[PDB]
Design a binder for this molecule. Structure first.
Ligand SMILES: Cc1nn(C)c2cc(C(=O)NCCc3cocn3)ccc12
Ligand SMILES: [Zn+2]
Length: 140
C-alpha cells in the first residue's frame, strides 16, 4: 500500500483505489495502473521534474529503503496478476530489486522529489509507475 499527497491531490495505484477515490476521481489510466483523486487537505510531497535514473525506493516486504538505478518510463509487457490480465503497461520503469504484490504504493524518490510508485515485479525486477510527466499535479 501507499500514496503520494501533492497539493489537493492523492495519487494511488489504480488497483488499490478506494470507493472514496472513485467518487472523487480526477484522472485514471488503466494502462498505467494510476489513479488521482481530490483531497480536502493539502499534501506535503513534491513531484520530481527531471530525467533521473537513480533513486531510493521503500520495500515494505523488507522494511528497507533500497538505492537503485532504474530505466526511463516505457511501454513494457507485464504478466497477469490478481488485478489485471497480461498486457502492456505504459510509463513503467524497472530496477533490479525485491518486490511482492503488497509492496505496491511504495515510493521511488530521487534528489528532486517523488518519481513514481511500485506497481509490478517479478524475476528479481521491480516496476514503478512514473508520475513525473503529470505536470498538472503541481498547479490549481
Ligand atoms: C513480484 C511482484 N512485485 N510486485 C510489486 C508485484 C505486483 C503484482 C501485482 O499484482 N500488481 C498489480 C498491478 C499490476 C500491474 O500490472 C499487473 N498488475 C504482482 C507481482 C509483483
Ligand atoms: Zn530527479
Amino acid at each position: 500500500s501507499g500514496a503520494i499527497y501533492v497539493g489537493n491531490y492523492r495519487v494511488v495505484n489504480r488497483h488499490l483505489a478506494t470507493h472514496n477515490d472513485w467518487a472523487n476521481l480526477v484522472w485514471e489510466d488503466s494502462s498505467r495502473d494510476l489513479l488521482v483523486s481530490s483531497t480536502t487537505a493539502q499534501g506535503c510531497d513534491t513531484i520530481a521534474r527531471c530525467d533521473c535514473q537513480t533513486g531510493v525506493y521503500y520495500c515494505s516486504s523488507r522494511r528497507k529503503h533500497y538505492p537503485v538505478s532504474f530505466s526511463k518510463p516505457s511501454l513494457i509487457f507485464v504478466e497477469a496478476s490478481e488485478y489485471y490480465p497480461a498486457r502492456y503497461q505504459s510509463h513503467l520503469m524497472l530496477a533490479v530489486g525485491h518486490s511482492e504484490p503488497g509492496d505496491c504504493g511504495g515510493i521511488l524518490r530521487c534528489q528532486h522529489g517523488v518519481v513514481g510508485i511500485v506497481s509490478t515485479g517479478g524475476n528479481g525486477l521491480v516496476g514503478f509507475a512514473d508520475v513525473r510527466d503529470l505536470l498538472w499535479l503541481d498547479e490549481e
